Symmetry: C4
Subunit: 325 residues, 4 copies
């Protein structure tokens, strides 16, 4: 079928996936108020484009935690990618390598840390981690990330328990509800790799993450799958950027579907954004080629949005490009 | 059928009850503007969860008017529970006893004060009262509550006349439209039991209730069945908490359907919330077991919402967890 | 059929009237934005009821321009009432006489000033006037109102031309687009009867009407049939009440369908409200008896709204009963 | 068919045009958020009409860049008008000549600059220009406008690339993404004709256009066909009027469908407005006569809106006629 935007990929996915699998990937928590708002919030922020700036040579490149990327649009962690396509996380990492962007590998992946590193030897790769009740397993994963050339740890901190959208009983054995800032101190001592706190929604927590020596904040409501009725990530992003006072790089996920979403998040001070569901829809369409397609659509929507806004590169995207109304 | 949230219980009830009985329980007054808003208002208050707090051991227990309860979620007065299930108020009190929460018995109950006390000897039980034109009947009910081990009187003060949603002619003979603060003075002198004013929507009235020696305020619009176009209870709650300056415990009812609703009401300073309609839907499903199910669903939704918000107990639920937008 | 609220009367009218006649009465101007808002605006103003005030003996009576009425709910001018019912304006005046309220007779009535005075000799009656290009006709109507015991002139000032919802060519010959404050000076000199300016939407115009010796302002957008995109009357009412500084009585029409609408308008400082369309729906249902029914439904909805709000009479309806949100 | 407002013309056009052509003319960019808002924004601005002003002799005439026009409603540039009607731009210019208003000829017209000048020798005519990569072509068009009696250049500055709603590859060869304020300096030196910057959405850019010696600003989001998620033109207009401090005439396009839209734009300080799509719907209906019809409907809607607002001419339309709510 002819797919020209990310929503077309989702609609294609709904048509080919078994209902249960599509619903698993689509769903948010409880009444799905935050799921709707992660998208609606982007539409409330309006763009104020500059004219006549010279955008002949647009350059989308940036850096994430000191590593160069082709665009400020990266693949976020999504569990069990082999349910969407046989090649799962291997298809995803190959697409990231082709695009020159980074892949955040899920802790619940249907491919090993080593298998993904060997599929995408030249790809920028990070590991998403939970601090499991079994701290030996946690340490083993960190050491394997270090050995297999992963460049950062994203520690997910918003899942002491799973959100309500016996598989959950199996995950309950793994996920530690007792995790505190003391366990973040332990993780910080365990590795010299950059660590990003994923799932922060409050400025005071972002300040605590900086105080604990972490290297970034991913402003995330876990794709609206954890606590329902939290705000949209794009709405909390300004408070978090303000709170960290430039000490660490702030990222965003939740609701990114269009190039204008990327532009609004960078205008409000995010270094880069991550996409979850759109990658899964790419896999459902055509594995590696479908992920490549989704990433290329986001890249060229972002390039156009930058050019129409008068931005020849990401360094000139400033706060006056957006206002909420 | 498979019912996992309170809305599923309502939909089941609509399917099994005669239309007239379902509509009687569902309805609000006039155009039902307040009925819609009691629910919509909860969705406008957004949650700002703290991460990494240690929520392994969540404790939902609290106290209502000095009596310990298992959770800050209690059964509100709803007339004529035997229309939903043969066991009516006896089923409800048995479920409350099982849960360790309190039951507010309606003045228009299809079970006697004594019958309910003997069904739930160990249950925490309160009596909801009107000051009837017949003050002898009113005094007899208070004395029977005292003798049968009820722990408080909830005096409903928002029904001088019934709201417009010859049965009403029968109730018109009972309900006194002349009640004033002088009649509250009389009730306060009549009993040493704690008295809660149920149906206050204004700070100045809440202050008057404190001045009259009452022991609590239940912020209530009578489930949107009295005056239509009053605000949602969750929207007036902050003014009332502010007005009473900590002198008495403030409760809320109206629109509570989810654990996140409970969390938002406690964040804004309510000690506990009451549920009306959800209990009737529980009865319609399966009597005592259906009421137990609804109360358990609200308990575990509330536990999850607390844990995801970083609250290990009700004492740490604070105003920074919510903001209206 | 069983009709319990004003909307039921409209739905009955749609069912019995020819489509063209129903649409003529229903319609507003252009895209009907103001028609929708005259109703929606009432729902945004929320009521803050006082409890425990003693409302056993509710008294709805008030006065309009020094004449006592049974309720602050009066019949507004609506052209060509004989299209709805054979008895037209005679049915309406008989119903007003039964209710003890006033009737504003249209300048475009299907009954003469004398015929209406003889149908309702004891009814409170006012004449709605245009200053026609033919000033002799205008003066003749005023003199006939004086002689036939009408108690005030309502001069409609918002129709220099008809709004866009060869009949209009006939009315174009009559209606003078040149009318200015100089013509108001002329009308003020012509009669000692109270004169009300009908169709004011701005405080500065209300102040000018006071300066010209007029005796009241009817805040009106002509039932949303003139300029579309003006505000709802309930939203402009506070500015107009503020502007006239108590010098003259301020009335409202536009969108009044319920007793709570009446209560909100009096809380914001209107002395009384007028109803247009609801009267026409009453006529379409059953002539005089249908108008009586509509007026009785508005009376008893208003009584209930007053009693539930803690108001035993109109003199205690105050601004703290309403807030916009 | 019977067409009484601009929306009726669009609905007629949808019925007669091939779907692809209707969709080409209708569409906006991406999710069409700005397309919806260009219309919705007009409805949020409310009118505050003055009564009793004397509007017998309404005069709609004004001037655009020193040239008298019959009304402050002018034809904006729309490419390839021959797809709607065989007579295309020749039909449009003949209608403008009949009305006494101006036509802005598209750079992508299906009629030559000379052909349009000879169809409408007496019509007020302007040329819309791009600064093409081929600056010789650009200069040739300007010289031909000068020679063929066009009175101004509208330089479109919001299209460095086409918005996303191999034809685009053909236009990509022409449209220069490198254009800067240096190229505006060049154009200003090239011609003594008035130059208007079309597509400005920011006050700082409007100030820069004034500094560069341009003679007007057309506040435009290119009919919501360029960057999606910019604000509605009526919402940015006040900032732009404020920013230029009366130095140049400010115009508006985007979403004008009704006479009240024209009145709101002039109240907020626009000298005149331009219409795009409505003209194309006129052509689709009946060529020159259909364009004349649309312009006459906008003229007489505007006259009525002015008269009902108490404005006898455009010079008395002031900012107190509008407020946003
Ligand atoms: C609990 N759970 C998900 C699950 C099962 C197994 C597993 F090993 C990990 C997880 C898991 C996934 C994500 C995250 C996170 O981080 O978002 C975490 Cl914590 C844990 C399920 O219930 C579940 C999986 C699933 C697959 C297909 C279908 Cl049709 C339905 C499904 N439901
Ligand atoms: C008046 N009324 C309710 C009613 C009838 C009898 C009674 F003894 C008490 C009441 C009563 C109920 C609640 C409250 C309160 O506090 O909310 C008060 Cl004040 C009084 C009815 O009209 C009514 C009951 C009813 C039952 C089934 C169906 Cl299908 C329709 C019904 N309508
Ligand atoms: C102009 N007009 C109305 C009209 C025609 C005749 C007349 F003598 C007075 C008027 C008139 C009415 C109200 C007002 C006012 O004050 O609101 C004023 Cl100014 C003048 C019509 O077009 C019209 C009437 C009518 C009847 C039935 C149907 Cl189905 C359609 C209809 N259309
Ligand atoms: C690019 N484009 C439009 C196009 C093709 C050719 C041309 F010479 C000019 C243009 C053009 C039009 C407007 C503007 C502007 O200013 O808004 C600019 Cl820059 C350039 C198309 O894709 C296109 C045209 C068209 C016609 C019919 C149908 Cl059904 C579909 C269509 N699509
Ligand atoms: C199906 C699914 C699986 C997810 N699995 C994980 C996971 O294993 N680890 C994790 O930290 N987050 C996980 N997330 C959250 C994502 O990392 C990301 O925060 C979210 O998808 C971003 O929102 P978006 O889907 O709107 O782009 C998952 C999200 C979805 C939809
Ligand atoms: C069917 C029904 C019957 C009610 N009966 C009573 C009653 O007898 N006494 C009383 O004080 N309130 C009564 N109420 C109001 C409730 O105590 C409570 O304020 C309301 O149900 C709370 O809103 P909720 O239904 O949204 O939870 C009733 C409410 C309903 C829906
Ligand atoms: C069908 C119709 C006819 C009207 N005719 C007149 C009239 O003859 N004179 C006048 O001053 N206003 C007239 N009005 C305006 C009314 O007096 C009144 O302002 C309006 O109906 C109030 O709004 P409502 O219909 O929502 O109650 C008319 C309104 C309608 C709907
Ligand atoms: C079909 C179409 C073609 C257009 N072509 C041009 C063009 O050739 N040059 C240009 O400067 N703007 C062009 N525009 C933008 C218009 O000049 C104008 O800004 C826009 O139509 C105004 O919004 P409206 O259509 O809501 O009235 C076009 C707009 C449409 C809808």
């Amino acid at each position: 079928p002819r797919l020209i935007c990310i929503n077309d990929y989702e609609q294609h996915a709904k048509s080919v996936l078994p209902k249960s699998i599509y619903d698993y990937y689509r769903s948010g928590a409880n009444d799905e108020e935050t799921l709707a708002d992660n998208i609606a919030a982007f539409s409330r922020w309006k763009l104020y484009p500059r004219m006549l700036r010279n955008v002949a040579e647009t350059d989308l490149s940036t850096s994430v935690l000191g590593q160069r990327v082709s665009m400020p649009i990266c693949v976020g962690a999504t569990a069990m990618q082999r349910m969407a396509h046989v090649d799962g996380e291997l298809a995803t990492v190959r697409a990231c390598q082709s695009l020159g962007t980074g892949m955040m590998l899920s802790s619940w992946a249907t491919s090993s840390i080593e298998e993904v590193a060997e599929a995408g030897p030249e790809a920028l790769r990070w590991l998403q981690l939970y601090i499991y009740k079994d701290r030996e397993v946690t340490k083993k994963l960190v050491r394997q990330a270090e050995k297999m050339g992963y460049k950062a740890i994203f520690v997910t901190v918003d899942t002491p328990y799973l959100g309500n959208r016996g598989l959950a009983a199996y995950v309950a054995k793994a996920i530690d509800p007792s995790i505190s800032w003391e366990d973040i101190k332990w993780l910080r001592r365990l590795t010299s790799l950059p660590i990003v706190a994923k799932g922060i929604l409050r400025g005071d927590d972002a300040r605590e993450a900086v105080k604990h020596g972490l290297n970034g904040i991913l402003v995330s409501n876990h794709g609206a799958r954890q606590l329902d009725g939290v705000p949209a990530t794009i709405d909390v992003l300004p408070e978090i950027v303000e709170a960290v006072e430039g000490k660490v790089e702030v990222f965003l996920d939740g609701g990114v579907r269009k190039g204008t979403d990327v532009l609004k998040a960078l205008a409000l001070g995010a270094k880069a954004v991550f996409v979850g569901r759109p990658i899964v829809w790419g896999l459902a369409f055509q594995g590696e080629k479908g992920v490549q397609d989704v990433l290329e659509i986001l890249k060229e929507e972002f390039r156009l949005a930058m050019a129409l806004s008068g931005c020849q590169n990401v360094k000139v995207i400033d706060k006056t490009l957006v206002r909420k109304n």
